[PDB]
Every structure is written in C-alpha cells, then in structure tokens.
Amino acid sequence: MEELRSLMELRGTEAVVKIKETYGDTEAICRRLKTSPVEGLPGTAPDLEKRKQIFGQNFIPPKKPKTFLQLVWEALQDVTLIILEIAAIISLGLSFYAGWIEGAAILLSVICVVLVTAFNDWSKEKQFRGLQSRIEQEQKFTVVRAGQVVQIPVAEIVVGDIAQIKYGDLLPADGLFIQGNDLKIDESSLTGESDQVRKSVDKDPMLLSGTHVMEGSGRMVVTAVGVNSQTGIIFTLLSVLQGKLTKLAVQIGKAGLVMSAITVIILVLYFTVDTFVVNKKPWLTECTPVYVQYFVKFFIIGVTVLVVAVPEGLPLAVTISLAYSVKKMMKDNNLVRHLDACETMGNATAICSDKTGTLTTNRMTVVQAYVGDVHYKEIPDPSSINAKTLELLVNAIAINSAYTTKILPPEKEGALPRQVGNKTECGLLGFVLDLRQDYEPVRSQMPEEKLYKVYTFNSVRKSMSTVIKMPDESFRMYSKGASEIVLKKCCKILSGAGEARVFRPRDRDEMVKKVIEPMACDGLRTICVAYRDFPSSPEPDWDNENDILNELTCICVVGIEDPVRPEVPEAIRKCQRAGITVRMVTGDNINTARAIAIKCGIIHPGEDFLCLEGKEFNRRIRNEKGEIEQERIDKIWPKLRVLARSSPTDKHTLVKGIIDSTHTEQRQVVAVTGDGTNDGPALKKADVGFAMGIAGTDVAKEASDIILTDDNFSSIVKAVMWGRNVYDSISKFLQFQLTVNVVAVIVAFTGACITQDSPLKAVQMLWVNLIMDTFASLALATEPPTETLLLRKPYGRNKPLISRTMMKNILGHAVYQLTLIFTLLFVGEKMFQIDSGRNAPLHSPPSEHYTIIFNTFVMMQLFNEINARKIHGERNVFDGIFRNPIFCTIVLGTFAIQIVIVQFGGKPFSCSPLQLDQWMWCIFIGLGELVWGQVIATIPTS
Amino acid sequence: KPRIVTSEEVIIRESLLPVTLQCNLTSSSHTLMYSYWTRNGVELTATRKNASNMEYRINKPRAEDSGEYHCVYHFVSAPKANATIEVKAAPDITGHKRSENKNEGQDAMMYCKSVGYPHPEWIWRKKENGVFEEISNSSGRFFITNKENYTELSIVNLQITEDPGEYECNATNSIGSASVSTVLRVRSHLAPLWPFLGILAEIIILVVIIVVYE
Numbered sequence A: 001m002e003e004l005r006s007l008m009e010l011r012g013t014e015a016v017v018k019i020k021e022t023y024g025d026t027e028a029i030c031r032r033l034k035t036s037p038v039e040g041l042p043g044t045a046p047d048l049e050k051r052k053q054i055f056g057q058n059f060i061p062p063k064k065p066k067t068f069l070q071l072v073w074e075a076l077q078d079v080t081l082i083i084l085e086i087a088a089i090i091s092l093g094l095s096f097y098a099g100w101i102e103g104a105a106i107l108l109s110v111i112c113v114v115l116v117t118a119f120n121d122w123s124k125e126k127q128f129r130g131l132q133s134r135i136e137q138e139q140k141f142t143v144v145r146a147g148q149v150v151q152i153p154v155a156e157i158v159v160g161d162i163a164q165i166k167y168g169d170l171l172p173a174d175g176l177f178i179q180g181n182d183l184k185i186d187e188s189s190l191t192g193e194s195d196q197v198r199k200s201v202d203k204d205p206m207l208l209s210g211t212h213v214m215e216g217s218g219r220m221v222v223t224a225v226g227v228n229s230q231t232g233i234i235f236t237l238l239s240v241l242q243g244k245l246t247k248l249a250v251q252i253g254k255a256g257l258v259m260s261a262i263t264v265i266i267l268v269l270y271f272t273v274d275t276f277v278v279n280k281k282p283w284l285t286e287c288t289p290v291y292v293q294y295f296v297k298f299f300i301i302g303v304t305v306l307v308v309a310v311p312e313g314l315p316l317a318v319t320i321s322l323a324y325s326v327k328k329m330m331k332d333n334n335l336v337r338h339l340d341a342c343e344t345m346g347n348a349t350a351i352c353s354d355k356t357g358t359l360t361t362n363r364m365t366v367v368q369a370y371v372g373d374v375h376y377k378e379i380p381d382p383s384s385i386n387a388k389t390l391e392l393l394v395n396a397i398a399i400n401s402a403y404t405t406k407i408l409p410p411e412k413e414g415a416l417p418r419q420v421g422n423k424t425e426c427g428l429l430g431f432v433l434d435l436r437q438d439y440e441p442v443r444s445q446m447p448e449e450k451l452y453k454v455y456t457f458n459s460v461r462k463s464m465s466t467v468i469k470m471p472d473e474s475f476r477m478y479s480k481g482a483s484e485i486v487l488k489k490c491c492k493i494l495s496g497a498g499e500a501r502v503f504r505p506r507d508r509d510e511m512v513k514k515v516i517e518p519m520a521c522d523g524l525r526t527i528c529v530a531y532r533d534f535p536s537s538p539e540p541d542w543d544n545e546n547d548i549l550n551e552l553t554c555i556c557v558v559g560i561e562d563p564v565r566p567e568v569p570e571a572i573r574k575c576q577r578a579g580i581t582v583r584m585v586t587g588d589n590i591n592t593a594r595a596i597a598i599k600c601g602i603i604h605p606g607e608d609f610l611c612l613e614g615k616e617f618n619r620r621i622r623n624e625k626g627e628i629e630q631e632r633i634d635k636i637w638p639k640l641r642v643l644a645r646s647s648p649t650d651k652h653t654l655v656k657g658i659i660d661s662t663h664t665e666q667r668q669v670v671a672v673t674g675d676g677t678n679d680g681p682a683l684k685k686a687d688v689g690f691a692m693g694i695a696g697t698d699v700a701k702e703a704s705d706i707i708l709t710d711d712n713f714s715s716i717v718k719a720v721m722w723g724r725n726v727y728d729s730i731s732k733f734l735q736f737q738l739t740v741n742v743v744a745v746i747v748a749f750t751g752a753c754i755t756q757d758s759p760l761k762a763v764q765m766l767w768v769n770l771i772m773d774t775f776a777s778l779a780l781a782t783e784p785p786t787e788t789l790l791l792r793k794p795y796g797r798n799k800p801l802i803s804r805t806m807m808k809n810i811l812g813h814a815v816y817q818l819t820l821i822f823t824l825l826f827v828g829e830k831m832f833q834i835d836s837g838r839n840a841p842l843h844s845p846p847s848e849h850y851t852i853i854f855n856t857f858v859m860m861q862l863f864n865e866i867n868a869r870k871i872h873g874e875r876n877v878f879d880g881i882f883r884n885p886i887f888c889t890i891v892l893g894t895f896a897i898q899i900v901i902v903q904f905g906g907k908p909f910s911c912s913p914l915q916l917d918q919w920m921w922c923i924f925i926g927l928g929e930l931v932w933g934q935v936i937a938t939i940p941t942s
Numbered sequence B: 001k002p003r004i005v006t007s008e009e010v011i012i013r014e015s016l017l018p019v020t021l022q023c024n025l026t027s028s029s030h031t032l033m034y035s036y037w038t039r040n041g042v043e044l045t046a047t048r049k050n051a052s053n054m055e056y057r058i059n060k061p062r063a064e065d066s067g068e069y070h071c072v073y074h075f076v077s078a079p080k081a082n083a084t085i086e087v088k089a090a091p092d093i094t095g096h097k098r099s100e101n102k103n104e105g106q107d108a109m110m111y112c113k114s115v116g117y118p119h120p121e122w123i124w125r126k127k128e129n130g131v132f133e134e135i136s137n138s139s140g141r142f143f144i145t146n147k148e149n150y151t152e153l154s155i156v157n158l159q160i161t162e163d164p165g166e167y168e169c170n171a172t173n174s175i176g177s178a179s180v181s182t183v184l185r186v187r188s189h190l191a192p193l194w195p196f197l198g199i200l201a202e203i204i205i206l207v208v209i210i211v212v213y214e
C-alpha cells in the first residue's frame, strides 16, 4: 500500500534509475524496511506480527463462505412443499366451519424436514472446506530467519523477509533481486511473452509474483504481499456419473407425477359417483362445506405420493460420498486438488510413469567398479588398488564435482546419511569415502578462485569437465562422462602399474562387451572418469570445446544403482491384474531402462513389447515430411512399454496419441505421473495428472489434479481403488431408495382403488421420505473401500446405471414387501383379532390395524437397508458392518425413534399404542425380510 | 284447584310433520304470573310469557324429544299447576362399545346407553351357536346394573374358556325394541412367547446358512 506498491512498473530499466534517483541503491531500501541485511532477519514475534498487520497483509483472500440461515431459506422454497403447506393451511382453516390436530401436524412436520435437509448441506460443505485448508498448509517456501534457512507456509511471508529462490519455484510475492547466479524467469503469466528473462541487479532486479523460476538460483527481499501484489490486482476488481444420474431422476419424477395425478382423479371420480349418482342425494348447499373437505383430504394424499415418488437429491449423492471420503484419502497419501479427478480415476485404463523418484528410491550408491583393468563386483580394499592411482582418482572426483554437493552427516535417527545435490555426484563422493579417504582436505586446498575453466553440466553434453592450473607450467583436465560419449574420446587407459597403455578400437569393442554391457544389464548406470594433460602452449583454445574434449585417458569406469522400491513390484502386479497397463518413460540408455523395467515387472522377459528410444520414436511418428500423423502413432503406442533416452515433449506426444486414438474399441483414459518444470502441458492433456510432494517443483504441483505425499508409485493404486468405491457406493444407495418408492407408491394406488384412503397417512409418509432420502444416503453412500475392487476390469463410459443384480434385488424385495402388506391390509382383522380399521369414517380415531401396517412397513425398510449393502450377489450381508459407525448409529437411532413414535405421540401421527405381542410379530416379519433376501440371492440372473 | 285441559298424547313416528302440544287454563280465580313448559323436570328455554294458554310446536319431532312434558302455571298465592302430557317413541341405542379387549384375569365392562320413553327394560343375551340364548349367572361373575336410560354389565376374573363371545342388549319398551351387540376378546398371558420362538428360529437358520456357505 506504501510507495513499494508504486515501485512496481519496471517495464525496461525504469525501476533501477528510479531507485538511483530516490533511494540510492537496494541497501537503502533494506534499511528503510527496518530489515536485517542479506545475512538474515531478526524474526522477533511481536515485530513480525506488527508488520504483518500494518506493513503487509495475509496472503490469503477470504473467499466468502455462506451461512446456515441462507441454506434453510433455500431449502424451504421447494414447490411441492409450498403445495403441501397451502393444502394444510386450507384444511386447518376449513376444520373450524379436534380435526385441526391433523392439519397443524403437517405444518410442523414440514418445518422439521426443511431443517434437517438444510443441516445436511451445512455439514457436507464444511468437510470440503477442511480439505481446502489442508491444501493451503502444504504450500511452503524457503526463507531465512535468525540466520537459519527454514521452510514456512506461504501465508506467513511478510514484507522484508529474505526468500531464497531455486529453479522450479513459484514466486509468492513481489520482491527485489539481491544476489544469485544465472537467474532466468518466465514471466508469461503477467506479460504473455514466453521467453526467459535474465534478472540482474544492474539491469532488471524486479521479481513478480506468479512467475515461474526457470533457471538459476539466488535470494530476494519481499516488498509487496497479498492484495497489494501485482497479480493480486488482477484477481481483485473482477462428470459422467452426475449427468447420467440426472436423466434417471427426471424419468422417475415424471412417472411419479402421472401416477399421483391418476390417483387423485380416480378418488374424486369414485367419491362423486358413489355419493351422488348411486345414493341419490340433493346438493343441499347448506351442508356443502363437508363435501369440499372430502376433496381436500384427497388432494393432500395425492401430494404425499408425489413427494415420495420424485427423487430429490439423487444427483447430489455423489458429492456427499466425496465429502466423506476425501479426508480419509489424505491418510493414504493422496491430496486431491481437483475433486472431479477422483471418480475419473476409477475408469483409468493406462498409466504412464517416470523411472526416477516414482519407481526407484533415487538413493544412488556405487556397487561395481572396473578401475585397474580388473572387474570388482565388490568395493576393493584401499591397499588392494593400483599404486598411486587412488590419489589421482579421489582428486578427479573431488575437484570435478560441484563443491555445493555436501553429504550431510547421518545425524538422523538411526538412518542412512542424507544426500544433497546431484545424485550421481554425491554417489561418487560416497564411493570415494567408502575407500577410506576424505575429499574434504583436497577440496579445502582449492577454493573457487583457483579453478578457472569449468564446463557446467547440461543434458546435451551428458558430461562435465574442469581445468586445473595447479601443475607447474601445465594444466590438467578432469572429466566425468556417460561412459558412452567419452569412451570414444579417450585414447589411452591408465591401467596395470599406472603407466598409460594405448587404447585402440580393437580392444574397445571387446571391452564394451565385457564390462560395460553387463554393467548396464544389471540395471547400473555407467559413468566414466578420465583426465588429460595440457602442456604450456601459448594459448590453449578452450572455446572450441569439441577438440579440447578429446584424447583423454580413462582413469576408471563405475556403476551406480538406484534400488527399486520394495512395494512397486506388487503394486504393478495389482495394477496389471485390474486391467490397467503401465508404461515407463525415462532418460537413461535402453539397456539400463530395460533391466529396471524387467526388475519392476513392467515387461516380462519372453514377450513382444517394443523398447524403442526417443529418436526412433520421433522418426517413426513423422515418416512423411516433418509433421505428426495419428495413423503412424496408432501402430507404436499399443505395444510401447519402455521409452528410453526420451525428451520432455515426447511424453506429451505419447499422452495425446494414446488419448485421442480411435483405433481402440473403448475410449482410453490415461494418467500421467510427470513431475518437472517443462512437464506442464502433458499433465493437462491427460485425464488426471499426479505430482510428487516430497521432491517436486511447484510448477508441476500447480497443474496436477492429485499430489502424492510419499513420492511412491504404490499410492497411485490406492487412488484407483478409492475412485471405484465412489461408483459402487452410489449403486448401493440407488438399490435402496428405488425399492421404497416402488412399494409405497403402488401401495397407495392400490388402496386408492379398493378402499377410499391409503394405509399410510401424510406425516407418516414424510417420516418415510426422511428415512429414504437423507439417512439412507448418509448410511450407504459412505462405505469404506476394500481391495477386492481391484479384481474387475474398468467400466466403460457407456453402460447402464441399473445392472442386472440390482434390478433382480429390487424386484424380489418389492414383491415380498407387497405380498406381506396386501395380506396384512386385507386379513389382519382375523390374523390379529383387532377389529378392522378399513373404511373408517372421516375424523375417526387411529386404529391398531393401520398402525401395525405402518410399523411393519418401516421395519421391513430398515432390514432392507441392512440388505442393501451388497451389490454383487454376495451372500454374507454382515461382512464388515462395524467398519462404518455412521451406518450403525443411523439404523439404531431410526429404530429407537420408531419405537418412540408408535407408543407415544399417537393422535398427531395417526398411531395407537401396541402391545408386546404385536411388536414381536412386526420384528418377526422384519427378519423374514433378511431370510427372503438369502432366498432370492440364489436365483441365477443369467 | 285450577282446571287445565291438555291435548292428547302423540306417538312420534318417522313422519316429519310438526307436533303441537296444547294446555288451556280453563278455570282459575287467581292472578296468574307466568307459565312454562318443562320436560323430565328440565325447564325449556324461552317458554315464559303471560300465556294463559300454552302451545309447544316441534318442527322435526324425533325419538330423542319424546318425554314427560309439563305445563306449569305460577300465580300470586296459589300452588303451581303442572298437568301432564306424555309423548312416547320407540327405543334407540345412541352409544355402545364396538369391542372389549382385556387380558385374562381382569375386569371387563360394557354398556348400552339409549334414549326414549317409556324407559326400556334391559336384558342381555350371549351368542350360543347362532341363537341368542339368555346369559346364565351360574359362576356369580356377572353383574348387571339397570337404570332409566343406562345399563352396565361387568365381568370379574375373566376366564379364557367361556367368556369370549358376543353380547347384545335388547332394550324393549311399550312402543318397540332396539338391540345392539358387542364383541368380547380375552387374551392369554402366553401371547409374546410364540413370536419369540419364531425370531429364534429365523436367527438360527440365518446363522447356519451364513456360516456354512462361508
């Protein structure tokens, strides 16, 4: 908000000259902020709190959630509830011309429902909010406080903080450039220009929030945070399953509508015909109110059919499942940024993964060496080596490798030493330490000033070299290479007694077959260490590095192995069992990639699978002219398992080729697990993209739907399982609700055809509606997953929601319930000896006959709620019933509330107290429900 | 003694014709103050005028109206002169219990409250294989109390073997008769046991199936 906000607007070199005019240099800005210099920050709590309040602002917009009263107001305005309320009001008013005890009851019952439903919403949204909070907690940035480098949440960054910038980082706030090395930033998110701007103190020290750090490293001081930032200004001043469920909802709704209309009209017609035509009665308008009362009652019951027939909240159920699964998924190391990608993971039919990090632990160690012309499958003794070559070897390894890569001491709790920096370099350093020497003295003899010619390691060269001026009137070149680029360049071997032997193509061709090829076949990356001498020539032309990196002398060749994680073989086996093919994309040579793939079980030994490289892949997919053609891709991808020596765009090419091919009968759903600065677009092309949390760039995490917090391939399998569970949960819920509304409706209609009333009154029907819609969804939609879900092939996009077994269960249980209820309604007077409540006159007291019918209906529904938990014809209903406490709580609470309703509160609910005998008979029928379920489970559907 | 000439008695039938009851104070040497119609000793509303001759018109005569009408004459210092007009009708039961459900070894009560005049003699009958034979008070467990328009039958220490049946109140009088019936049901003390056995059988067969097949 201060002059720092106006400081932004470089647009060239305006800011540097403005600073030179007003403030002087960056040091004046640093002291103005009352901030410690590049050394560190005070970090005192009261001061940071004060400058958080006044100097800056919390880096979090509030996003403005909604309230409970708004939810109840939105739930109240349902049209059918308004119709029911106006009907109740009319009946209550007309009853005065204790009948009112009916109408009033209905009103109160409605006020209950519109409460509970609203509460349900206010619960589920809360869950989602919690998840979002956790995501904001996982965003952390590296800062310097009290002279210590610590990681803090991005929301804690305040003005004046010293933030350290590394490649791949997402800039959280607007700041000033202080010091660093070759810092190149992409500013395409604010300017639209996708070129790498080089930031320097004397040219352009502005760093903008929201930009991507493409290369280099350094430090910066924060000036603008939050709404005061440049990117905050723009922010201010401005599903297959759900779609498939909606059609079922509307179809059932219209069927219920026509059924209710038919019931109302047949009641009115029969009443009028019987009262007037047959028993000839004069109109006698003096007694005309009674007639209209007879109509209003009819109308009410029609409405109470409709509210039960139309499924409201059927397409919403999916979200409820997510709201009670997502949190638990976080305990399986799956942080879900986009919820839509959850259920999509159920239908995944391909996974493209990368070798390092995901499948291999990235713990580089040296297990084989060839130094001394003798193959050494074990680490030799320091004395057993050739004379005087160990000093040269350790000198080459120490001086060549970057000095920033320091193996931290193993002060962790009984743990292996921690590795920092390039993995190959620190692996070689650990190998040097394993021979019982110390590179620390050799590195201490040489600061950075003494070295004068170092070639920075880059993937094009695949090698890195340095030049040392220590030898008098001479220079020495040390080089590490990929063991394939530099073996051609070396002209002599230091071997035998230390004397150089002339290296020839003749013995090179056989030595590559003896050691290098088997070394790669054991899944070992091969690295060659060599050196060269430069005499005191007048001027060695280091500019022409092509000729300078030649005629070297091979000191040694070393194999480095990154062990495969113990869980990923079984994980890949389980993935392949569930119909999900797995492919590997890596930058190693084809031999090592093939060996590691065989170790992981991706490619079996005796199988026809292509293991072609990246260059061959690009050449094949562009045979004609120089463009990509889908037909050519259509031949490689179906049998492409391992892709080695690839490039960042090759993954995108493969992903799009698989995703948009029409060759397959079934549409393919891919799930790429990329993680990198240049691996953005691919993650967006695939259906769902996984990122790595422990060691992953912020650019990769920004574009990913799911974050794996263990950086493990196995957790991916978990995601698939959870996704499938969602589908299943919906199915079982859909198996219960439908059954109820197949029975209830029919019962009402049949009563309307024979008697002149329905056995189920209005408030009882609202109770049944509450049971079938909210409590059923909470009980059944939230079911824990099992590993057995991974034993079926992924479902197609086009397939009916109601399967064969679901429809068989619906029909059978509806048949049993209908038979029992009709038999009761017609012969209960003689079965129980309780008189008959049939054809009761208007305003009659409640009878035990209809109360028994209602009670047995509710008991059958509860035991069918227990039966509904098994979809695939499983006989054992009670399997894992105590894994879900919500189910038990809801079922037992409904049972207790039913016991309270039948006994007490009789007149408003049209119930009469029941003896113990009738309660036991009702529960006997309820258990007969489960017995008949076991009976029907043996009918073969095919 | 004042002389009052009253209209003849009327038998209320189903005809809707209004009925007029007349009293005429033909001989009275005293100063009349007022007169009033009463039925069964209950003053009738809005019947107090000069009314040296009384008329009562009933537009819709029904069985509930028939009774012992009186036209009472009250003077300065003479005793009130009442006379009598009696209106009869067939008896009719207004209220009765449809059924009586009690556990064995308890107290059972039934009643038949009716209306009419003359007050009906009440007799109770019990169904015996299709013919309503008279009720026998052999065991001394039946108690019948008769009143003007009310009857009450009480049974003590219900036995599940003989008592269950249908009981009728016959309610005869000098015009006609009217009878209604009630059903008595006696419940055993062992009723809850059978569904419990059914539940046990269901549970054991369910457990057997589930255990065997898994």
Ligand SMILES: Nc1ncnc2c1ncn2[C@@H]1O[C@H](COP(=O)(O)OP(=O)(O)NP(=O)(O)O)[C@@H](O)[C@H]1O
Pocket: A355, A356, A422, A424, A425, A457, A459, A461, A462, A463, A464, A480, A481, A482, A525, A526, A527, A586, A587, A588, A589
């Ligand atoms: N410090 C180094 N000096 C010389 N060569 C190196 C060095 N580090 C790696 N290499 C080699 O140079 C190439 C760089 O590969 P690198 O980017 O590290 O991984 P990759 O081989 O692409 N496999 P991946 O990590 O799965 O992407 C490989 O041939 C390495 O063996």
Ligand SMILES: *[C@@H]1O[C@H](CO)[C@@H](O)[C@H](O)[C@H]1NC(C)=O
Pocket: B005, B022, B023, B024, B053, B054
């Ligand atoms: C009875 O009184 C009425 C009403 O005044 C009168 O019209 C009628 O003549 C009287 N009858 C006799 C017999 O006195």
Ligand SMILES: *[C@@H]1O[C@H](CO)[C@@H](O)[C@H](O)[C@H]1NC(C)=O
Pocket: B031, B032, B033, B034, B035, B049, B050, B051, B052
């Ligand atoms: C009615 O009025 C007449 C005339 O005054 C009188 O003789 C007679 O007693 C009165 N009867 C009453 C007041 O009941």
Ligand SMILES: *[C@@H]1O[C@H](CO)[C@@H](O)[C@H](O)[C@H]1NC(C)=O
Pocket: B038, B041, B070, B072, B081, B082, B083
């Ligand atoms: C009128 O007096 C006679 C006297 O015998 C009596 O029987 C009769 O009940 C009295 N009428 C009323 C309504 O009390």
Ligand SMILES: *[C@@H]1O[C@H](CO)[C@@H](O)[C@H](O)[C@H]1NC(C)=O
Pocket: B113, B114, B148, B149, B150
């Ligand atoms: C019977 O007569 C008495 C007389 O006091 C009266 O209170 C009662 O209401 C009458 N009706 C019944 C049904 O008992």
Ligand SMILES: *[C@@H]1O[C@H](CO)[C@@H](O)[C@H](O)[C@H]1NC(C)=O
Pocket: B137, B139, B140, B141, B142, B143, B144
């Ligand atoms: C039945 O006999 C018993 C004998 O104790 C007696 O108390 C009771 O009043 C009698 N009831 C009738 C209706 O005769």
Ligand SMILES: *[C@@H]1O[C@H](CO)[C@@H](O)[C@H](O)[C@H]1NC(C)=O
Pocket: B170, B171, B172, B177, B178, B179
């Ligand atoms: C009452 O008793 C009479 C005389 O025996 C009998 O015929 C009749 O059925 C009973 N009354 C009615 C209304 O049924």
Ligand SMILES: [Mg+2]
Pocket: A459, A587
């Ligand atoms: Mg690479």
